[PDB]
Nucleic acid binder design. Structure first.
Ligand SMILES: [Cl-]
Ligand SMILES: [Cl-]
Ligand SMILES: [Mg+2]
Ligand SMILES: [Mg+2]
Ligand SMILES: [Mg+2]
Ligand SMILES: [Mg+2]
Ligand SMILES: [Mg+2]
Ligand SMILES: [Mg+2]
Ligand SMILES: [Mg+2]
Ligand SMILES: [Mg+2]
Ligand SMILES: [Mg+2]
Ligand code: NA
Ligand code: NA
Ligand code: NA
Ligand code: NA
Ligand code: NA
Ligand code: NA
Lengths: 186, 95, 140, 156, 154
RNA sequence: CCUGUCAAACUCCAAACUUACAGACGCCGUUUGACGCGGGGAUUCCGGUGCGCGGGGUA
RNA sequence: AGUGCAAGAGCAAAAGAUAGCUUGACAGUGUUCUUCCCAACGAGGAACGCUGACGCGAAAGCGUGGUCUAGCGAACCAAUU
RNA sequence: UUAGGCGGCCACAGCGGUGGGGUUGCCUCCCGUACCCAUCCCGAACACGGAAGAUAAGCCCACCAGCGUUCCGGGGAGUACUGGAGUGCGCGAGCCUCUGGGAAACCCGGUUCGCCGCCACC
């Protein structure tokens, strides 16, 4: 920018999207990466492999195409994340993928975080991933119990119209239950 | 030379042009080579580890197995056969 | 366009740059939340050679905690103009600084895909005076 | 000491003051002479062109310049002309003043490296070339043979 | 296709230059070889440029020299039309010559020594201290220029 | 802004050239066995000169 | 800028700073390069492994002292495990 | 790719600036702290929960060359330098010819305001 000697960071560092030092350590395993990403409204889970001209995504799952299986609730929460993980995990298995390492990008390794939920789901789908059980949420929160109880302190629906008034961690079970057998795209 | 350490007279070859300065891309540090492939040896000034003796910068050897993640490349110094322990970060496929 | 262009108060830092404290107490009551130590850098003649060393405290207030404070701070100040930032900030007073900016500031304070706010979307000294002056007082 | 000792450019360039100390000051008084307040807004422009690469000790530079400018007082102390010596003595020079043991010499002076065909002096004058004469005396005190060249001046 | 003639001796000539002449089958002064115009051969003659005389000869001249100084891979045998016909793909010297010139074959391919051991130039050459452009005899020549040399050393 | 100069221990630049490997041609080797491996016997470790590039030195 | 100390080189979501935790400055045994270009030669040094035991981390992973090139010593004898 | 995620090359992509775009696939800003989690003080950030509002930031799209960068034409320049050769020149420093290569600065005019891969998606 300033001169011939100036040093311009790599594009993905400029965009503040890729942590290259973490990326290298990640690529060390020689295993596929379980890319866990979030958005204000959604949660994505991809299984990426290394390629000659860039990464190759062999299997993915988005919290949006979750409804495609009977999801009638918001998609930016814990239950959402886990399921998206399991969905991508399953599609992963179908693709012949057996193991991966968790890439959480620029997100924080906070216990009970959605990225770990994503990790828990992918694992249950059958994917073999280096993890640590007590950094994961306690199942109930994964189910969405923390939100149901939050609506108990109602007075006004936590969900604007949406579905239910007292929410359903049960809707969660029905869905996980569904994903664990047959159905298309899995 | 006034001294005989490995970095004697390496000011040039072990320095980056101002623009290539800073941590290098990970793609080439993870590159995989097969036994028999021809690889060019060239130290990446930005990459500390996996280096080999500066005297071999410029050599083109043959991958013959590895040690840990590091590769074992056979070269011929003058008329002498030598084996060099080096990481992908400092290797490039010939042709 | 507007609504997302109109100024707002983001943190008010009240700090007492002492030179070695007991002062925290008053900051705690004047604001309403714990003060933070103020270590210093460099060794200097004012018998301040200690690098890591408590030499004052500060308190960053946000939201109501900031208004409810300025609703008494401002009144105790007269000044205006020249004493304003080029980014629409101003410090008066024991110091009390007011950082002002518009709605999409998080874009530069978050971790992922962060970005510096465009000069156009920045807050000017003038656009600042307006906002505040338009809230219980007068400029210059 | 004779110019014979330092007039050739056979040694490596030796100019890094960060590695050389005790370098004698230069004898060259000024580089800009005459009406330095004015810019080269003159009809005629003559130059003194060295005809062989050589090293010129600040000694000779000062004597050559003085002899030229001191003479350009055929026009007066505040005459209308501007005189410029464009080269500076950057090359530090030594002398081995023990015999050939530990002979790296000690700094004794400075000299300017001028390549054949460069102009060492440039004067600016109105059709009043007394300067041509100021230079016959100038290249009289520098090692090389020289060429007195006139540039803007088809007023022959 | 160019005719190469060593005009300067081995004493004091770079070794890598001497080897080159040897790779081109010339091991003595006045020995001559025919070389195809290829990138690889071009580089070689360029390196040998200062101790040789080269150029594209005329059909005739090649014919005169072939007849006068060509030899079997082994033996004294004169290479005349009959020899050419009874030993090569061609029917006579001219046939061979043409093939050589159009770089369709080589002296070896036809059972002939790659070297035409010429005679000292009758009347002497232009000197081995200067190139042609300077009145000497070194370097690239004209077809008419090469022919005179070759013919003088016939 | 304009204007005057430099670098063996400066470099936004940058040769010729030297150099690793590979293919091609050449030359060479397969009864003249090359490339290489193992073993026996040395001599040698005062050098000099020309040319090119040098460093020191008035030389 | 800083990174203990020459000089040159490396380093920015770090190799720097702060905080916290920890003792991998661990035992064993090698591969290779270096010392000694080519091209034989010891001590020393480094890179890269493996076996075992550990530290930290969600994990990939990092730690075979300090970012890299100086800070080193044979046989005999003694003391020590 | 009517806005996305992971990347390769790592400025041709930087710096600066203009215009355009969203009841929705969307991304954001945004709204909000019972929870997991969090600030040596602050739900600012990090983390979690969520849509009342907005397209003003960001982002995506179209474009501008003033600066920086890349490549090209013409000029500088076959100049500077240089591998090989010479009973060519010069008191000498050094130069010249033949042969094989061949620059930098700068000026003027173009180019460049990223390209490409995988996945997902009215
Ligand atoms: Cl994310
Ligand atoms: Cl090595
Ligand atoms: Mg050098
Ligand atoms: Mg014979
Ligand atoms: Mg006679
Ligand atoms: Mg003669
Ligand atoms: Mg060399
Ligand atoms: Mg280290
Ligand atoms: Mg003893
Ligand atoms: Mg003892
Ligand atoms: Mg807009
Ligand atoms: Na780099
Ligand atoms: Na003495
Ligand atoms: Na003279
Ligand atoms: Na050793
Ligand atoms: Na403290
Ligand atoms: Na916008």
């Amino acid at each position: 920018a300033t001169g011939p000697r100036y040093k311009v960071p790599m594009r993905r560092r400029r965009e503040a999207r890729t942590d290259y030092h973490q990326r290298l350590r990640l690529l060390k395993s020689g295993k596929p990466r379980l890319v866990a990403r979030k958005s204000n409204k959604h949660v994505r889970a991809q299984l990426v492999t290394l390629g000659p001209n860039g990464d190759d995504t062999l299997a993915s799952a988005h919290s949006s195409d979750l409804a495609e299986y009977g999801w009638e609730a918001p998609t930016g929460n814990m239950p959402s994340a886990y399921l998206t993980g399991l969905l991508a995990g399953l599609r992963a298995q179908e693709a012949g993928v057996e193991e991966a390492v968790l890439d959480i990008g620029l997100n924080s390794p906070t216990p009970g975080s959605k990225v770990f939920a994503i990790q828990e789901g992918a694992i249950d789908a059958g994917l073999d991933i280096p993890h640590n059980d007590d950094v994961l949420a306690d199942w109930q929160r994964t189910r969405g119990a923390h939100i149901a109880e939050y609506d108990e302190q109602l007075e006004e629906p936590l969900y604007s119209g949406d579905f239910d008034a007292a929410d359903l961690p049960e809707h969660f079970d029905e869905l996980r239950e569904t994903l664990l057998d047959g159905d298309i795209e899995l | 030379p006034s001294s005989n350490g490995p970095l004697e007279g390496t000011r040039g070859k072990l320095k980056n042009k101002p623009r290539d300065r800073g941590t290098s891309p990970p793609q080439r540090a993870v590159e995989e080579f097969d036994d028999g492939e021809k690889v060019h040896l060239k130290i990446d000034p930005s990459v500390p580890n996996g280096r080999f003796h500066p005297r071999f910068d410029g050599q083109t050897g043959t991958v013959e197995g590895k040690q840990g993640d590091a590769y074992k490349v056979d070269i011929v110094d003058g008329g002498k056969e030598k084996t060099i322990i080096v990481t992908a970060a400092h290797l490039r496929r010939q042709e | 366009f507007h609504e997302m262009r109109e100024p707002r108060i983001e943190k008010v830092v009240v700090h007492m740059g002492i030179g070695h404290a007991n002062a925290e107490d008053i900051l705690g009551e004047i604001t309403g939340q714990m003060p933070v130590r103020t270590k210093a850098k460099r060794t200097v003649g004012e018998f301040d050679i200690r690098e890591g060393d408590p030499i004052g405290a500060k308190v960053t207030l946000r939201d109501e905690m900031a208004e409810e404070f300025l609703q008494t701070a401002l009144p105790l100040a007269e000044l205006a103009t020249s004493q304003f930032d080029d980014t629409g900030n101003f410090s008066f007073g024991l110091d009390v600084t007011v950082n002002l900016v518009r709605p999409g500031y998080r874009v530069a304070k978050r971790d992922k895909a962060s970005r510096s706010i465009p000069t156009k979307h920045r807050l000017n000294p003038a656009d600042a005076v307006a906002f505040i002056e338009s809230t219980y007082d007068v400029e210059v | 000491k004779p110019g014979a000792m330092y007039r050739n450019s056979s040694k490596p360039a030796y100019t890094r003051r960060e590695y050389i100390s005790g370098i004698p000051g230069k004898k060259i008084a000024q580089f800009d002479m005459g009406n330095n307040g004015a810019g080269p807004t003159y009809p005629a422009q003559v130059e003194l062109v060295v005809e062989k690469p050589v090293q010129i000790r600040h000694n000779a530079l000062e004597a050559a310049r003085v002899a030229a400018n001191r003479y350009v007082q055929n026009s007066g102390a505040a005459a209308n002309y501007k005189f410029r010596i464009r080269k500076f003595p950057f090359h530090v020079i030594r002398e081995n003043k023990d015999g050939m043991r530990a002979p790296f010499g000690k700094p004794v002076g400075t000299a300017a490296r001028v390549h054949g065909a460069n102009h060492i002096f440039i004067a600016w004058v109105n059709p009043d070339p007394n300067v041509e004469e100021a230079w016959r005396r100038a290249k009289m005190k520098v090692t090389p043979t020289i060429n007195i060249d006139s540039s803007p001046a088809g007023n022959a | 296709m160019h005719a190469l003639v060593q005009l300067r001796g081995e004493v004091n000539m770079h070794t890598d230059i001497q080897d080159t002449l040897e790779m081109l089958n010339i091991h003595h002064v006045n020995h001559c070889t025919l070389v195809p115009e290829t990138d690889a051969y071009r580089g070689m003659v360029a390196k040998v440029n200062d101790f040789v005389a080269f150029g594209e000869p005329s059909q005739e001249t090649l014919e005169t020299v072939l007849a006068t100084r060509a030899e079997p891979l082994e033996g004294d045998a004169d290479v005349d039309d009959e020899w050419v016909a009874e030993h090569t793909d061609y029917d006579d010297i001219s046939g061979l010559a043409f093939a050589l010139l159009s770089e369709e074959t080589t002296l070896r391919e036809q059972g002939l020594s790659p070297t035409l051991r010429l005679h000292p130039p009758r009347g002497g050459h232009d000197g081995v201290k200067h190139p042609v452009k300077e009145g000497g005899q070194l370097g690239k020549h004209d077809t008419e220029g090469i022919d005179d040399l070759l013919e003088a050393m016939r």
